[PDB]
Amino acid sequence: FKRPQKVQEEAATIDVREIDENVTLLAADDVAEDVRDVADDADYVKVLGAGQVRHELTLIADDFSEGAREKVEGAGGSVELTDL
Amino acid sequence: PKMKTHKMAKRRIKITGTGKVMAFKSGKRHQNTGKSGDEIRGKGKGFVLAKAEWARMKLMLPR
Amino acid sequence: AHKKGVGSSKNGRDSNPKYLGVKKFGGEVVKAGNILVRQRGTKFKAGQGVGMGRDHTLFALSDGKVVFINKGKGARFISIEAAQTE
Amino acid sequence: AKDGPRIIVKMESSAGTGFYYTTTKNRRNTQAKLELKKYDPVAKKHVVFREKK
RNA sequence: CGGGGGGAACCUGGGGAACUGAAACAUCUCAGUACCCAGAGGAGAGGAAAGAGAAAUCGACUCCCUGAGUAGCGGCGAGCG
RNA sequence: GUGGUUCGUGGAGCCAUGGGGGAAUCUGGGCGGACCACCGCCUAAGGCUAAGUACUCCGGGUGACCGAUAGCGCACCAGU
RNA sequence: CCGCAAGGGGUUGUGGCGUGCCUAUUGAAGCAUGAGCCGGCGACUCACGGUCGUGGGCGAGCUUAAGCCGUUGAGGCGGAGGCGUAGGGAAACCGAGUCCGAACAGGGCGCAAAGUCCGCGGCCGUGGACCCGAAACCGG
RNA sequence: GAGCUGGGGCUAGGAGUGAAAAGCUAACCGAGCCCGGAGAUAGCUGGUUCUCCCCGAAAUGACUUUAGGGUCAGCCUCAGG
């Protein structure tokens, strides 16, 4: 099922509660009205639902799951990378 | 230094955080088997225990 | 390039028939009585047989399964007193 | 399968197009170009079904 | 005017193998290894790109770590990588 | 028809060539992996180039390294 | 004969019960082999991986190569990386959900229990690798 | 006399020579000998060390170019629940 060489693309693993929390420690920076995009644990921002959005925050990242983006609306924003 | 029957690693293989590993049913099909239908409904996945130790291991590391 | 004769010599292979769950134990919607697969189970226990009487299996759930003639297909229900109101 | 030009010959049957097919073993034995029956291709359901192949 | 003869080890080219693993063995492996040959040096090897890859990004060659035992090659087997 | 490359004939390219055909001088001419359009890169088919890595015959330093059947086999009219 | 005296030393006359010692063996005294005698050499090791267990430093844990500092020579800076931080799937991709499918029937998982580096070990792979053992092939 | 011979040389060891048995090739060539692959592989063979504590094995079953090997089970042992 494998290929005849290389190719490949990209993407990463970044999610809810995850942030809200450890991002609660992210408040040492854009953790106010929160313009996320750490820079501490991962590579290629993605947002996992599970949990309960919060810290009301706009996130400059790739994307996220259903609920998440939803919960998001719970009390925050959602900005996507480059062009979307 | 180490590698792994990368093979089997290819075909049939790949674990869950659970510390367990599985590969696709594997009755007959895909060769000889005019056989039947319902029998068809005979290819999902099969998780063999014990041995799945050589396996996992031998693979170990990346998978 | 063939085979010979006057040597009957012809071992036989394996089977695996049983009564699994025997009579009157914790009944589980699973292989009831066995001695003829493709079998067509029945309802509760069985008592019909080339013998006369019948057999109860003080164990009740969905159903069990037959063996084609032997034993004696089920039908004479018998959930068991252990099937009342909790 | 064990392809044996012995009255033993494997074949299928389309679904008027319902699209694809479904398994079947056969025997010239009788009725040669004979072979019809209905089923249900990914195409809705049912559909006449010739077998010839 | 220069050369050729050396020289433990190391250097590139020229040529170049079975064992053994695959629990046989013809593919494969050991390897481009061991050996032989030529020749440069005190170091040769190589070296400013009809290069790399794709963020319109990078820029000599070399070497150490890393990339990675990954992308991947295959009686998809042992392995090579 | 072989090479090297991770590529063991493969959808299999680049560079290197054993035989045969045998183009172009900047809208030229290879390239980004069959090919094709468009984009993007590069400009061959001559040459020189110290330094950063390797190696111990040599000299020194140092040893949870040895003590005469151990250490190089050979601590001294030994490759005899 | 009593430099550890009313207890022991040495030697044995008798009688009393007794088949040596090693490997491989159903089974061994051996008549199966191993060894004449003494002294010294002489055989489960190291490395990189991985693997469990344990001694312990932080839970996000941890360090390459190198730069500097070095009687003793004193470590200290280096943050590419890599394992954990969801996973599920051939994939697209979705995602605390997901793949089969058009169905709420199951497979994988969610449910944090969280490791990670190191040290020291029983092991597993590559290694000549528990130690010597042959007939042979291949180069000069 | 396809005679015996001294002295001088030529061929060569997967190849020579051979009035030819596989003979002879520096005293055992059914393919020499030394150094090198290399400490080749070697289910077979041996060999396999100081004390002591604790428990206590199998010599069956299933598949093997597998049957005097070894995979998985079955019978051992230690750590926790």
Added chain:
RNA sequence: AGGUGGAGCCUGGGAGUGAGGGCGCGAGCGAUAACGUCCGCGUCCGAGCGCGGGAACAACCGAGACCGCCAGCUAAGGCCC
């Protein structure tokens, strides 16, 4: 139910043998012949299940070897020497 008392179950690391025989019994073969072999039920031995007995004799009857030389009852088996 359980008098018992000390085996049991799961997870996990480390294993060894992967071919045995001997006896009773129930079967197979076999001249119901072999210290023959072949399957079963229990035991037995395992290079120490070392000691007693049957003279001697793993092995069959009794026995479970932590250690105590100048105790005591017995087993099986014996008591004219």
Added chain:
RNA sequence: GGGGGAUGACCCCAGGCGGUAGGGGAGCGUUCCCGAUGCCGAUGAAGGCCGACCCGCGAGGCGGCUGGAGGUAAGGGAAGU
């Protein structure tokens, strides 16, 4: 294993304890690196030679004779044991 252990230890009884492959725990000497606010010896380093105190033990200590110069570590580390 269990009844209280002060660090020892002491008391009961339960309760065995024969054991090769092989599994777990604990100790011994061997040559070295510490000299974790360590150094003995010309009235002997050490090896040797001989022994009726200390330990289940593998070893210890210690005393007598020998012999010409070393090395010991109360404790942890290492290994060509």
Added chain:
RNA sequence: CUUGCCCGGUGCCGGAAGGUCAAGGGGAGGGGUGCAAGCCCCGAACCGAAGCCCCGGUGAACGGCGGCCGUAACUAUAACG
């Protein structure tokens, strides 16, 4: 002195008209991208080599060189059938 009998298979010698068939020429036709000229492949009808198939010749070339029933045979193959 004398070497007889068989070329169905085999090796060979001759034949080469006919089948076959490699590289290759040589075009129908399809395909991908192409705004389009183009730009790459797959390509097949036929022509096409030895070889092999097929015809013959071949024995101091390999090699091979029948079976049973009856019959004068007072008894036995046999002269015959």
Added chain:
RNA sequence: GGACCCGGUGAAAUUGAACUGGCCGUGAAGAUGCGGCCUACCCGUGGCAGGACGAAAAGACCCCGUGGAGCUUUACUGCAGCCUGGUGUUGGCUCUUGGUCGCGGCGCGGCUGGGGGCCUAACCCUCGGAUGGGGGGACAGCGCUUGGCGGGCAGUUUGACUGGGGCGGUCGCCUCCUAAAAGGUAACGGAGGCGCCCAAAGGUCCCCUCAGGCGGGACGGAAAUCCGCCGGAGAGCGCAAGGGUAGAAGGGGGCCUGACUGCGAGGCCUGCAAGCCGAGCAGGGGCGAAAGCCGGGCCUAGUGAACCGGUGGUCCCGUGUGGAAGGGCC
């Protein structure tokens, strides 16, 4: 002439160790060493061979290691050489027939194929007295690809079982018996079947009552065909057995194909993978008024891993993006 007595000199393999007697018994089954017994002082030298399973050598005869090495052929493959098409430095001149498409034909036309000739300037050879002549000559040598023969050689291989190796057999799977009564076990122990098949033995809805024997009549004197009695089904079921079992699986007729996709709670047997069963859930039918049955067969044999590929579907990947070669999924 040694051997023997003297003087002089003065080895050598094997050996655990040993003060090693016979018996008859024994043990692993051919014992000085174990039991009972009988003879039995301590040592030596010249001898004689029997026992110490004496010495020599880790059997050469044997089997076993999916050890090795040499020769063999219609063993496997591959190379050396040899034959061979096209291609090259292998240049000129002429004689010719074939194909083809275009405009059985012929005329022409491009195309291109076969071939015959001295020459001849390569090439080679030739020499013969110098470099010129001579002969051959487009050959060929010789290079590249083709194909072929090809044990001449090179490298591997040529199973297991096996109550000694071989020859002989035999290995999968279905049943009986063996299994001592749960399950299940060797034997080169007994006997016998299978690598099919049936589109209608399929699904249902509707009807049937067997073999046989006896008694009575056409063609009929075994053995039908009908009629009348008797019947724990002994007939019946494509195939071997064994279980089944008429209520029927079993015998007909009616339409019908579920001889289904998506799945399957939950079990049998099980070291592996397999193997096998199955209500019920959904979509969609068929049969019946309907309560229900249908996911092939009365069963248990009719068999195969995973890779190596074909093909009809996908429109998941597509190695600068647009696509396709190619790949993944069915």
